[PDB]
Amino acid sequence: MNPKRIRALKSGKQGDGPVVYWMSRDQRAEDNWALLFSRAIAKEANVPVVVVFCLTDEFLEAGIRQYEFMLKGLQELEVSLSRKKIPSFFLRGDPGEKISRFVKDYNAGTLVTDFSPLRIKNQWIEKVISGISIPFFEVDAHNVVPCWEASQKHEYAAHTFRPKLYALLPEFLEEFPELEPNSVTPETLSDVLETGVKALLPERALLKNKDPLFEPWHFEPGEKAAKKVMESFIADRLDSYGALRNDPTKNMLSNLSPYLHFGQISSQRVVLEVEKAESNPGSKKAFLDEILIWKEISDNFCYYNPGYDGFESFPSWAKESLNAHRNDVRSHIYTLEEFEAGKTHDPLFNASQMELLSTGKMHGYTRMYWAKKILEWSESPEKALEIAICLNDRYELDGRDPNGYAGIAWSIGGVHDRAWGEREVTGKIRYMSYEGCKRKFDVKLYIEKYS
Numbered sequence: 001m002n003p004k005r006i007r008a009l010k011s012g013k014q015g016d017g018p019v020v021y022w023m024s025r026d027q028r029a030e031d032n033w034a035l036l037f038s039r040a041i042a043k044e045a046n047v048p049v050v051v052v053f054c055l056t057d058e059f060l061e062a063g064i065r066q067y068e069f070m071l072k073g074l075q076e077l078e079v080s081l082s083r084k085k086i087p088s089f090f091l092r093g094d095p096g097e098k099i100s101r102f103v104k105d106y107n108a109g110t111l112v113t114d115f116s117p118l119r120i121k122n123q124w125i126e127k128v129i130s131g132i133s134i135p136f137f138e139v140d141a142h143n144v145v146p147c148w149e150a151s152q153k154h155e156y157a158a159h160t161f162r163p164k165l166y167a168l169l170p171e172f173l174e175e176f177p178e179l180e181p182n183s184v185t186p187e188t189l190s191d192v193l194e195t196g197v198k199a200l201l202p203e204r205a206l207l208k209n210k211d212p213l214f215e216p217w218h219f220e221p222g223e224k225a226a227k228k229v230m231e232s233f234i235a236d237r238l239d240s241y242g243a244l245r246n247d248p249t250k251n252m253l254s255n256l257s258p259y260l261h262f263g264q265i266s267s268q269r270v271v272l273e274v275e276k277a278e279s280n281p282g283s284k285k286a287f288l289d290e291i292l293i294w295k296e297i298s299d300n301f302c303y304y305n306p307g308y309d310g311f312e313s314f315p316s317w318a319k320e321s322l323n324a325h326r327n328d329v330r331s332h333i334y335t336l337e338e339f340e341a342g343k344t345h346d347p348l349f350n351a352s353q354m355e356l357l358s359t360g361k362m363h364g365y366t367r368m369y370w371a372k373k374i375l376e377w378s379e380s381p382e383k384a385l386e387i388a389i390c391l392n393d394r395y396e397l398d399g400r401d402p403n404g405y406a407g408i409a410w411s412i413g414g415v416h417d418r419a420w421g422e423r424e425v426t427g428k429i430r431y432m433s434y435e436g437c438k439r440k441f442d443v444k445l446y447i448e449k450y451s
């Protein structure tokens, strides 16, 4: 139990009641350092640990697709926590009011949360801090190396983050102890879900048909399903991962991101299991570079760049280049709605958007293509960011995520990239031509599937 995984958010005066884990990003009972640390604090204080989760007011900014995925996972999590004699409380409202009142009503001794560098989580933390008098910690349960330990600063390139992260893997890549049950046992989510779906229904994504776009059978939610997705990746897809990760016609990615986003599975767990797997070495190297380096550099980016969703966080070479080309005439301009409906003149863009609409998980390779075309066919880089973020967060099951803001910033602003050949409109931002994709994979086949 490495104390570098835990950080103080606010000093206070310990109470004598239960330890409260305010669960937010890591919605799982296994392999969860935030829950493990909370249990350990509780054991030392001779009190139970309890879990609280806030069903916030912001759910109406995404769709049923994410809400159902999350809540069905939480239904399973209730069962799992209760088998460990750990009660769970689902508070309807936003954390400032609800966590502060829970702490008071339940005489909590200590408050622990998990770690997210996103602005909304920090907004919540500030409001909670002002409503409590007990000590308040956070634990990095999402990264193998705690974000504030991996580097002291924003890293401008994967090649400067990678050696720092790997220098720390021998220390921090380690097995998880079993979660000790509590010593004794100290509105349903279904009804919550029904109420939420009712509120979301008018904005559900539909065909002109009125038939719903989303297909909810591609990724079944919850901890158990996540483990099966991990196991089938290692058994059936990891060998081919190195060769096929950039081919969106093949179903050869891990498909773990929706689970990783909600923390229904630990990336540290996935890494442990992949490390021990015997597969082609280039495949393992490639996969670990995505789930370790690119995933954790995305937390690095959001943690150290308050303006991570804005033009100002782009590297200076990219800001200067995009500025130099700000007044270039765009070959096309599309509205948010035209992008959203897949109604551009580019059939590969449209098919990428259709994959997002129907499955909630656009292939990683075409996400790069897609965001770069939003840059190319919008009035400014600032507008491009807004559109890409809006669509990514509204329709990706894995959205509203540091990987999203960092991936969009990479695509549009060259964050964690270098200058390439100068073009009009897009300046030196890496370009991803349609023709280049055709040389790379069977574009026609991808278009046929998603049209």
Ligand SMILES: Cc1cc2nc3c(=O)[nH]c(=O)nc-3n(C[C@H](O)[C@H](O)[C@H](O)COP(=O)(O)OP(=O)(O)OC[C@H]3O[C@@H](n4cnc5c(N)ncnc54)[C@H](O)[C@@H]3O)c2cc1C
Binding pocket: 245, 253, 254, 255, 256, 257, 258, 260, 261, 290, 291, 292, 294, 295, 296, 298, 362, 363, 364, 365, 367, 368, 371, 392, 396, 398, 399, 400, 401, 403, 404, 405, 407, 408, 411
């Ligand atoms: C414009 C754009 C937007 C993106 N938005 C998101 C988002 O909202 N949420 C999200 O989780 N990922 C996002 N990504 C990163 C990446 O596209 C997805 O993580 C990946 O496609 C998810 O599929 P998978 O789990 O099957 O991937 P795999 O290839 O199996 O990768 C395994 C895991 O590694 C991590 N990973 C892989 N690629 C990246 C990457 N480029 N950056 C960061 N972490 C990575 C993810 O945790 C992923 O689940 C975005 C990328 C771009 C270019």
